[PDB]
Amino acid sequence: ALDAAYCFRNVQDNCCLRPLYIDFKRDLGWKWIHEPKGYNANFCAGACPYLWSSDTQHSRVLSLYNTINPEASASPCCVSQDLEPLTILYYIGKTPKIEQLSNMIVKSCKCS
Amino acid sequence: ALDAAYCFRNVQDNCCLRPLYIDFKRDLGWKWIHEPKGYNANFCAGACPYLWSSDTQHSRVLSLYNTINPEASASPCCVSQDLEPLTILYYIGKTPKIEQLSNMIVKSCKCS
């Protein structure tokens, strides 16, 4: 998979997970989250070679088209695959509460 | 929507549907399809401004992050949204048959 272990080994031009830490107050302007101060959101970026696409007929027809006619490219797009939640601390008045924020973290990537 | 009527008006740098005709024999090497000789598959391509992403928390957090910190971009990806089937003619020996090939055509685009 295009995850931390495979992708964080070196810098790669191809579709891969990229490290990113987001500080809620500083980078999002979210003051409602008291803890943690930030988290490793990560993101997906990089070139998609033509055979890296699947799960849709249009994508596999497009991949086959591209492999035969490269010069006239319609290159696939590096997108998120596995997403994970994050537990945070917020307040209801003076009472500290905890809740899960869904799909905050990207763990792996794929080509569209 | 980022469909033919909106997108085929002019050339646009931003995420939009792009016209593409694929000839089965000539461009795919598919000799099994006798009719039609090709079809308008189309494809999605172009720049995604930061607020064009939705449906995932990670995508909206990433869009918000990007709007605040543009220079340090993790730009969204222009992908297919609505897909349509195509009916074709093939043979089982000397008998002509027809069948639907699913999700062959892209009708609209979206930003990841």
Numbering used by the authors:
A (entry chain A), B (entry chain A): 303 to 414
Task: Provide excerpts from the study.
TGFβs were discovered in the early 1980s4, and three close orthologs are found in mammals (TGFβ1, TGFβ2, and TGFβ35). They are ubiquitously expressed and secreted throughout the body, where they are pleiotropically engaged in the physiology of nearly all tissues and cell types after activation and binding to TGFβ receptors of type I, II and III (TGFR-I, -II and -III). Human TGFβs are produced as latent glycosylated precursors (pro-TGFβs), which consist of an ~250-residue N-terminal pro-domain dubbed latency-associated protein (LAP) and a C-terminal ~110-residue mature growth-factor moiety (GF). In particular, human TGFβ2 is biosynthesized as a latent 394-residue precursor (pro-TGFβ2) arranged as a glycosylated homodimer of 91 kDa containing three glycan chains attached to each LAP. Human TGFβ2 GF is an elongated α/β-fold molecule consisting of an N-terminal helix α1 disemboguing into a fourfold antiparallel sheet of simple up-and-down connectivity.
The crystals belonged to a hitherto undescribed, tightly-packed tetragonal space group, diffracted to 2.0 Å resolution, and contained half a GF disulfide-linked dimer per asymmetric unit. We detected gelatinolytic activity, which points to a contaminant present in the purified hα2M sample. Accordingly, we conclude that the low pH of the crystallization assay, together with the crystallization process, achieved the separation of the LAP and GF moieties that we could not obtain by chromatography (see above). Taken together, these values indicated that P41212 was the correct space group, and the final model after model rebuilding and refinement contained residues A303-S414 and 23 solvent molecules. TGFβ2 is internally crosslinked by four disulfides forming a cysteine knot and a further intermolecular disulfide by symmetric C379 residues links two crystallographic symmetry mates to yield the functional dimer. Here, helix α3 of one protomer nestles into the concave face of the β-sheet of the other protomer. However, a major rearrangement is found within segment Y352-C380, which encompasses helix α3 plus the flanking linkers to strands β4 and β5. Owing to an outward movement of segment W354-D357, α3 is translated by maximally ~5.5 Å (at I370). This, in turn, causes downstream segment E373-C379 to be folded inward, with a maximal displacement of ~6.7 Å (at A374). The second protomer is rotated by ~10°, so that K396 at the tip of hairpin β6β7 is displaced by ~9 Å. Overall, we conclude that our mature structure may represent an inactive variant or be one of an ensemble of conformational states, which may still undergo an induced fit or selection fit mechanism to form a functional ternary ligand-receptor complex.
